[model samples]
Target: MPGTKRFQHVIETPEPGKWELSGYEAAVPITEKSNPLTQDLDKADAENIVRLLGQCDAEIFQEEGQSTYQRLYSESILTTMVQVAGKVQEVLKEPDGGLVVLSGGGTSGRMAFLMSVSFNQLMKGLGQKPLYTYLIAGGDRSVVASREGTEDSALHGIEELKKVAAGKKRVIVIGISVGLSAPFVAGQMDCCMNNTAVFLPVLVGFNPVSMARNDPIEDWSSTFRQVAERMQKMQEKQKAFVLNPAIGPEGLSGSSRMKGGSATKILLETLLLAAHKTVDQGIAASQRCLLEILRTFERAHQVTYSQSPKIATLMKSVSTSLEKKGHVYLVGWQTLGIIAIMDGVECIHTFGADFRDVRGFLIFTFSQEDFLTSILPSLTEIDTVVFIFTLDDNLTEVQTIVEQVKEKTNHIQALAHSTVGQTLPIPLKKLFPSIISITWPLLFFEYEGNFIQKFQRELSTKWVLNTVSTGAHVLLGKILQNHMLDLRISNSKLFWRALAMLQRFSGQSKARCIESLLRAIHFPQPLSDDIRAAPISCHVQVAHEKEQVIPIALLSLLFRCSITEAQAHLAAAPSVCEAVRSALA
Candidate 1:
């Protein structure tokens, strides 16, 4: 007990009071609400940072308890999920003529693509026709570099939706927006609602329908709120579905990639698995199976967070890399490989990270040439190279990569998954002295059926990766009061968020914040009269050409100086989060 004073460090978690009750942030939707639990996140050390996030994420599994915001286990949500799984069953029962189209924008869109890839992979495993179709806002490339501007275009959304489901006789459209606010998803919802005979509409998000975005979509009379309200009406008539179980705000406020994204994966996996049970095993999609699957995912949540200490340790390693400007490589095999890259891309955008900060390469996609070129040339002790795989993966290949990676540095780790009693090779284990292995229970797999083990493994990979990436960034001082400071801020909503940062941190009024944002957005090149009069979405479009203005804007507001002076201060900090911290100090 007297060894190293392990439990000596402590900080009180501020009461989980109310984000909506706050003065400046009152009108914010539930998803955008600043998380009360993580207000002191930036003040916490690496391990405490993860503990705060673990607490924040645990809210996803929290009971609704007759609260205003419904949660995952709420009765209405369960009823809607049951109906949606039945809809999925209808498609699986008629695979030849039926199809599912998963669509959204940015993180929501990426989640759609991942789920679709997963389902089609499962379908191929069963030797059945691929029953799912996916559309991201700007197609597959967005997953690489996020074409955020495309998220605003409803015409593009409807056109893309039309293209995918043109010939399908019965299509189920599941459109996801973490806040129920993506115009792309809203547009698709409109299309799905109108095409009643062919398309069944389903909307998944974290905000109540009343809290759906009320802002007008340019060149379209419709709003996301109107579409949701109509969808809500149709659901009462048993014609459509809306499953928005409020998971509260994300650990990182408005960063839908965490809790909402996880729930979306949970829902999609549950719905598809239930339908698989119905069509493949002739097991009806019932309340019992659904609840069990939901609970199964909840246990997964527990199993994942149960390793919080290990995850926090890994986070410190990654955060140290960021602090040192060192690179991180996430290499894996199979679907775990897919998750590696998926997590990698989000890290880039989430933290406004430099291109080479964190790179993800699938071992399946990694070539000898890639090793000779990109990785081998850049590998070093400062950099962190982590491998993600199950015991079922090709160990020979895993060892080959590990050997190559160790040649450059011994700071390598592995996130290995294996069933209980199926040991990780001792020789391979020795290379990864800091391995985080999740041994799935045999009984758990027995209940889920053999086919679901892979899915659960992928879910497990996501949780660990999310924790490490987020916690590491938190340690790197990328977040302020659960809001990401270094966010790319490339879209309309994000433009307002950019302005909001200037307001919150600089203690400037909304009007003054607006001026500084525009000033920073067009920094080094002053905004003309025409630019000032232009629409905000126009400002957003222009913002891409002049990117990452929050740091510049916040500094200008802080010092009451010009853009050049702000830029001078930022050169010292290099990150908005750090710059804000420095200025505040």
Candidate 2:
């Protein structure tokens, strides 16, 4: 196969085509391959990091070229989207007994919840019954807590789907696993296929069907690849559909919350919103409609990243706080609060940061006096505070908190949105030393769904915050060669990832790596009979209690040393990559 090209603006790296075929890319899925555009991402200044990431994200909209897989702009993808939206519309017309269910794991699950709530809200406004329900693997706790290990159990996924569809006569199940690798999603697909009378299964992922995960899922009989293939056979007669379009690798290797999450939001919004429009206004979804929405998102991407300087400044400010062992708190009004909370929670899984290190608070939940007396005074210059609001929010309330936050720490920033003429007052702007505001142009379809207009703003905010938080962590040396080496091994998926990292870096066999990992995870003493006999699930549960377990395991394996020695090495060099590199050297 031919190779993908590097971005023109990335002058410091070797051509992307060379890296595309070398080392890790040969063994991992496309979604897990490191991007050449960001080869030196850890060292890149904030402005270049923003530009490199934008170019990487632009891959989501490209037409197919060298790759054998279909892309988002491919004709087949557009047709599949129209067909699925039509199925949704069909179910909507008979709404009393029918259901629309969205399910996934991690970032996929989070987007499912957001989209289901948004679409149901739109349906209610149109005087229709709300037909959507969402299932995250660990329930609502997973929505904000990063319960990633819950993604391992196929049985749990099926049970959750059955509970959500208990009373409905008909159900349309959309299972999203960005890389088609989650066992939780695979189990849902299996359940839907078996219960064809009540469930219409639709799979959304970012890979070709041929590349779906084929490894045996422990006790489960079938792998995700097997279930996906069966679904394709069923799709031959329109009984089931698989929407897997290759969107290229993520900006950071295997960090699906970036491009994968953004594409999930965009595609689901386009299809479901189109379905709602069809039912409410008697208009059918056409290729033109889907294309227009995609183009609007492309424009949104440009408009959001166009403020690279401001974004870079925000990234630098947040990284400074994190480097000082300080906190970065996000305070937002309304649905933006939900967005901020989800982003903050992801920092745990993405960068191995403490949950308290980055937290988001909904502004309405606490009183100004309570915030002043209880929250603000405890913080100092080391802490960085951000406020997310729009002109539509209560500016008077924002101004009050803004003034109070100013008194506590001058390291305050604001990401505000408004129309051209209705911007926040100069007094409020003066309070924040750093502020980034985007004014959206009124589009022709302003009347279609006002809530969607808010969604566009939400998407813009999501992009900006995703960039700033991700960039901040990269600056802290939490990432090594685009891989999240410091991630928590809280689930089966992550357990395998930890083992894979150990093997790849140490050149050890899988069996040897697993043994070494167990030693490091359960440290000091030899493995007990119960520990040796325990399943992978139990191993992960024990491993989750320890910080930097993977790094310690890899270091121990590489140097053939004890876990205590590895811990000491890590302490001497705070950077995980540096610790490993010095020992190897």
Candidate 3:
């Protein structure tokens, strides 16, 4: 590619070809042999990268130019990248997850994939589970070039997202492009929001930021805003950017493959650095980390958009081979089993695909009586056995069970485990496990299955505590010894129950434990003075704002019944606050 261009607003590339800005028209010396891990150059290539980024930034962030560049076409494509990155983070912090991506070809879509994978896994490494996926128009192949067929359907874009987010609690839309932003892709985002911040992931890249002026948002740009605001909000260094100049599209056309790609990388790295630092300070994930992860995702739009041969081949094979068999089979335990079921259910429910395609046949090892009971009957030799159980001194039986399954099929995939050491059978850990099962296949669909079946399964298991608790509950369970985690603080009876549980588990006095419980949930949000002066209602309004919104209100005032008598009634209600409110209201 010669020079940076957008989906529209044409710019001259070094070579100047008949072009959509999405294609790389200017060619840079290939430094494919060089490793990013080492600090050597392609020194000239590196300089070009730097210069391209500078122009991208000057066009979008400079005070004189920023107003003109405020919309997608009106500014540097680089600014669009930063904004989209910010939005991705906002959606990440929320409970729900799904993002729809649109791109005709090249960096924009690839960046989306790479960012989602890296950031989400980064969370998992730090003990946070991520719920994110994207709808890539033109498919994974479009990471390098357009898959004309996949991008043909507006409905197909929607379908891909449904596959990723059918059961997710929330969804976001992201679109990125230069001049090639597709109308079909725009429609895909339209499909997501019935109301309030269309869950669709909208990341659109263009020559002119001005496009933002006319185009409605609530997609990836919203996420981009989240990332930028988060960093600005904290006044923190290593924060996510809404617009930065150090890295951007090459002076050459559509060379995001070069300069633009690196900027994307830096943005992601910086955001992650902030997030990692926050966790180091023992802070729970806040909107800031969310923003970082989103920026990380936006960065991905510029790099690593293509698929590996092994995975691509496997994807083709899986699609060509599926029989619509009864409930696609999944093998292994814990995360692997969960992954298997999760992916299997998505295939059936979100894609309007059949559950029969996935046959979850976990290793029925003698030690795993629970698993054996769950499997039900003899498994077929050809069924896909996704072995996920990690081998530890205590898990020898789990290993044996994996071996038994291996005897059945040469076609096995291990998710998230390193399989380099063992000789007999490798593929212990598939890179980016969740992405393999969900995101990749999504490229093929036209409308996502609502994922209703999977959600039901998740809800059914919501309260069952075990070694596999997800999110905040897992940490709380560790502190509380996995019992009575859902405690009600409405009244004396419920309060006493919490105290009793703490006393039993922590060997503390009822009075002391009560103090701890109060302290545990007692952290405060920034409060406003006017609200503090207002009369206290049934709602405690712990974290007061300008309007004094009642969040977690209903802390005071008891029901007519005494504390002890309220126990059974409280339990009958959905949540402690609801019980307290209904009884006292």
Local distance difference test values of all predictions, in order: 0.77, 0.81, 0.34
Candidate 2 residue runs with Cα over 4 Å from true position: 1-27, 364-373, 446-449, 508-511, 525-534, 562-577
Give the alpha carbon lDDT tens digit for every residue of 495-573 in model 3: 3233334433333333334334333334342223333222221112221111101112112112322223444555567
Per-prediction TM-score to the true structure, in the order listed: 0.91, 0.91, 0.31
Q: Please give the ranking of all candidate structures by TM-score, highest first, separated by commas.
A: 2, 1, 3
Lowest summed-lDDT stretch of 10 residues in model 2? 1-10
Which sequence of candidate numbers ranks them by lDDT, best first? Answer: 2, 1, 3
Better of 1 and 3 by TM-score: 1
Q: Write the per-residue lDDT of candidate 2 for residues 375-412, one digit (tens) a residue.
A: 77778878888889888888888888878877778788
| Candidate 3 weakest ten by summed lDDT | 462-471
- lDDT per residue for candidate 1 within 169-199, as digits (tens), equals 9999999998888888888889888889998
